[PDB]
Amino acid sequence: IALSEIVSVVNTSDGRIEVFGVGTDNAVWHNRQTAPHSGSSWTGWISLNGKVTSKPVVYINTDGRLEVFARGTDNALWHIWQTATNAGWSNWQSLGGTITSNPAVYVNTDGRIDVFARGTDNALWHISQTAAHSGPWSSWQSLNGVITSNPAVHINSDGRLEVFARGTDNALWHIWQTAPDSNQWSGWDSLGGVITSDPVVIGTADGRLEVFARGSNNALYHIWQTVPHGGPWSNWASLNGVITSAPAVVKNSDGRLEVFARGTNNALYHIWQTVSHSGPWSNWATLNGTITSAPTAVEDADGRLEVFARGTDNALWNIWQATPSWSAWVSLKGSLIDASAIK
Amino acid sequence: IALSEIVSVVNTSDGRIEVFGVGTDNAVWHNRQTAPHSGSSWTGWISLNGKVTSKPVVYINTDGRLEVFARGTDNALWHIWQTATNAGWSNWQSLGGTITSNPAVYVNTDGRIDVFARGTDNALWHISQTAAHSGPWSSWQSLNGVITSNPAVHINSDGRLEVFARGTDNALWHIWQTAPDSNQWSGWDSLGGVITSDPVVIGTADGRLEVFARGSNNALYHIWQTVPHGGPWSNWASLNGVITSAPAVVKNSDGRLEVFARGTNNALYHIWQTVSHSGPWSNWATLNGTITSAPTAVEDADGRLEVFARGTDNALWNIWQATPSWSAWVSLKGSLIDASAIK
Ligand SMILES: CO[C@@H]1O[C@@H](C)[C@@H](O)[C@@H](O)[C@@H]1O
Ligand SMILES: CO[C@@H]1O[C@@H](C)[C@@H](O)[C@@H](O)[C@@H]1O
Ligand SMILES: CO[C@@H]1O[C@@H](C)[C@@H](O)[C@@H](O)[C@@H]1O
Ligand SMILES: CO[C@@H]1O[C@@H](C)[C@@H](O)[C@@H](O)[C@@H]1O
Ligand SMILES: CO[C@@H]1O[C@@H](C)[C@@H](O)[C@@H](O)[C@@H]1O
Ligand SMILES: CO[C@@H]1O[C@@H](C)[C@@H](O)[C@@H](O)[C@@H]1O
Ligand SMILES: CO[C@@H]1O[C@@H](C)[C@@H](O)[C@@H](O)[C@@H]1O
């Protein structure tokens, strides 16, 4: 697997970016913008404690409360959650299980967080809240398959969760709810190709899933639903380049997709749709830096992309999107590790 | 009450704007962009039939299905829904009650649509889906108060619904859920002022409610939460102008608020936050035309504002936020009436 993202990031319900990563102590730490604008100062790193053995994944409940999922030292899924929106945190609590990947997390149309992770059998498993933004949690449940990457999940424009992963043949595979909120899932299906990164999935401005992944020649590839929330999918297409990390995809404030990834000189590169969403793609361009993780990208409250990546000093660095050139690479300090359960 | 909005507008799950209005036959008609882009052509007007006696209000269920609420000729609340996302429509069905205002509609954090309408006692009443995006519906319940305008609803950044309506003293009042999804609401709180239009409410880029209304001198006023999802509120602040309709507010793609209203010469006027969201407001500027309703504004899938208003020929007209100085007005044809239950 190509080098992973090292933080999970969200724009919170009060328009501040909040970033979560794993320290050299194997605890989860978070850092938050003090103001809801590009170029804001940062709180600085605060520990949520714990001892984790995967990438932490943050998700926002439908009531705005942040919730973090990660594998623990006992290999169970653990979580920790804000007890009120943007306020204080609970203690860490186990959700049991024994998992062998990073979690992937999404919310159902009924407000129930659904968490996906690989099992000891190498199947995809899932567990979910039984009520909107609320425990108790369900029991684990298998979705079978046998997968060789961390999973990625997104919602279709008809409300059906759909999960993506690399299979034993190194192809992109997927599986989907048969109906919104449903514990009844489809059978596994294959989209072919050969991929050398975790896949990353996004919903387009016109309601279609689009999936990006590094290919066997280390170029960036993508593939998409041809109609909203349905098949057929397209043929694989190449966006070229050569990337030395997992790709990260985000939607600009005007709908245009943009993808970020480490280049072969360890600098950050990006490529974007031009003209409009679903428009033709640009040439790759550099944003400089020397980075030691995959980048992570998010839209801030001013409608600008912000990217995060670990530096040569093992600190987290940040850069954001401005008219002619981007911002400075700015250090948020800290000392992060790649705790990804599959590397 | 100042002259109302004539259509209800929504972004569909496949990135097209869809507008809903009442025809000269008192049936609900709709028109949809053919393409998810600014300046797209339109399907043309299609009837949903029925016979309504309020402004119709569309809302998108969390599974992507559109649903329209309107008062019927029997003064009850009626609704009609898509049977599949962006597909065919149900028959009209009654939710009963007797209502004396336009409905206001919002979704709870648990995916259950809540509908609010003034009752025969001039209290605010509500009815909701009992499950996520699904019937059956609840019994009617009173949220008390005595109100003299149409209600407006939005969700807080902590997931609590909040409703605004003018009171018997002509002040802006409000009530809120004590917790997300709850049927337990607060008492009516006065935010004072004297308002001469329905209030409009929006959520800011940093998670605060902000309310706009015409005041006693026909100026535009606004008031806001000073902290995300909490009090205290600011004082009322004038945005000046002299407006001859209800105002409509929308958020740009970069978070800046922009308000639209009819001026004294019956043209469309607007005013916007400059620099960034929550920044200082512009001067009023005209967008020309001659309109016979309040405008309705929405962001399209390219991140551009689109405004709709009835024209002198009773057709619906459109203008959108093109680079230099906005598009030309284009007619979408049709023949619309103002069916608002309170005028
Ligand atoms: C809070 O508890 C600590 O962190 C959790 C995430 C688990 O790894 C547990 O075994 C460890 O003791
Ligand atoms: C269902 O098929 C099994 O699981 C898929 C996810 C792939 O790994 C495939 O090659 C494997 O045999
Ligand atoms: C712009 O700065 C460059 O890239 C950062 C991400 C850091 O690795 C730093 O040490 C390096 O000089
Ligand atoms: C389909 O039913 C028609 O429209 C409804 C919205 C009601 O006004 C009803 O009385 C009328 O007959
Ligand atoms: C269900 O209750 C009925 O409808 C409500 C909306 C109110 O108008 C009430 O006075 C009336 O009795
Ligand atoms: C709760 O109090 C009732 O409702 C408010 C909205 C006001 O109209 C007030 O005059 C009335 O007595
Ligand atoms: C731009 O055109 C002007 O405004 C439109 C909204 C229509 O009312 C039209 O008749 C009028 O002349």
Author numbering:
A (entry chain B), B (entry chain A): 29 to 371
Task: Provide excerpts from the study.
In this article, we studied five members of the PLL lectin family from P. laumondii subsp. laumondii TT01 (PLL, PLL2, PLL3, PLL4, PLL5, collectively referred to as PLLs). All studied lectins belong to the seven-bladed β-propeller structural family. The saccharide binding sites are located between the adjacent blades and are uniquely organized in two separate circles around the monomer.
The PLL chain A blade W1 interacts with chain B blade W3, whereas in the case of PLL2, PLL4 and PLL5, chain A blade W1 interacts with chain B blade W5. In this study, we confirmed that PLL2 highly increased ROS production and discovered that other PLLs also activate a similar oxidative response, suggesting that the immune systems of both humans and insects recognise all these lectins. In human blood activated by zymosan A, PLL2 and PLL3 inhibited ROS production, suggesting these lectins interfere with the innate immune system reaction in the early stages of the Photorhabdus infection. Different behaviour was seen for d-galactose, which inhibited only the binding of PLL3 and not PLL2, despite confirmed binding to both proteins from ITC, suggesting that d-galactose aims for different binding sites than MGMR in PLL2.
